[PDB]
């Protein structure tokens, strides 16, 4: 188990341009191409990124490279975030993966409003309240399992919820 695996489980790995939950072009492991309603824009974007004429189709090898960059991008951004940076600083490799996963699914901003609840999943004092609070989220509501698996990781620091 690693973050690549975890996100394939959670977000899935698609080798053809697809629309996301908001009707945007995406490829691979949630890699958004463009906000443009236009398919050709999406393909220009994709070829520039891939460095070849892909015609909307990429390899498992190219998706993973994309994915790595995006992960490094999220890290950079996490570290630039007043609120997040610290939490992050703290976390072990597994728990970091859980956060990065949230960031992926909701962004630096979606995830900065949980800081606290996040902080507490880890404190025996507040941990049960933290969870409760997280379950009242839309986030959990829309994607219950993913959320459930994310939280248990965070709480446990293991990958058990992924096997």
Curated annotation (Swiss-Prot):
Q: What is the annotated signal peptide range for this record?
A: none
| Consequence when changing residue 117 to V | 50-fold decrease in enzymatic activity
Q: Which InterPro entries match?
A: Endolysin_T4_type, Glyco_hydro_24, Lysozyme-like_dom_sf, Lysozyme_dom_sf, Phage_lysozyme-like, T4-type_lysozyme
Active site location: 11 (proton donor/acceptor), 20 (proton donor/acceptor)
Tell me what happens on changing residue 30 to F.
Answer: Almost complete loss of enzymatic activity. The enzyme is destabilized by 1.5 kcal/mol
Primary location? host cell
Q: How does activity depend on pH?
A: Optimum pH is 7.3.
Task: Cite a GO CC annotation.
Answer: host cell cytoplasm
Q: What keywords tag this UniProt record? A: Antimicrobial, Bacteriolytic enzyme, Cytolysis, Glycosidase, Host cell lysis by virus, Host cytoplasm, Hydrolase, Viral release from host cell
Q: Where in the cell is it found?
A: Host cytoplasm
What's the protein here called?
Answer: Endolysin
Which gene is this protein's source?
Answer: E
